[PDB]
């Protein structure tokens, strides 16, 4: 099984910087779909909640210079 999830992200907005997050998508294990919004600065991702977790989007935001919020 695999399901959608969406999050706020500190500092991805207003620039092409979202491409440093979304280019890596197609290299990850445990995903199938995702979509940035630069206008507002948010993200949606589809992943397998048993092969992976929010950890398949957390490190890819935290090491890229930003912070994840999934409340």
From Swiss-Prot:
Taxonomic superkingdom: Bacteria
Parts forming coiled coils: none
Subcellular localization, as worded in the UniProt entry: Cell membrane
HMA domain ranges (all copies): 3-69
Protein family according to the UniProt entry: Belongs to the cation transport ATPase (P-type) (TC 3.A.3) family. Type IB subfamily.
Protein name, entry field: Zinc-transporting ATPase
Organism (species): Synechocystis sp. (strain ATCC 27184 / PCC 6803 / Kazusa)
Source species taxonomy: Bacteria, Bacillati, Cyanobacteriota, Cyanophyceae, Synechococcales
Residues included from the entire protein: 6 to 76 of 721
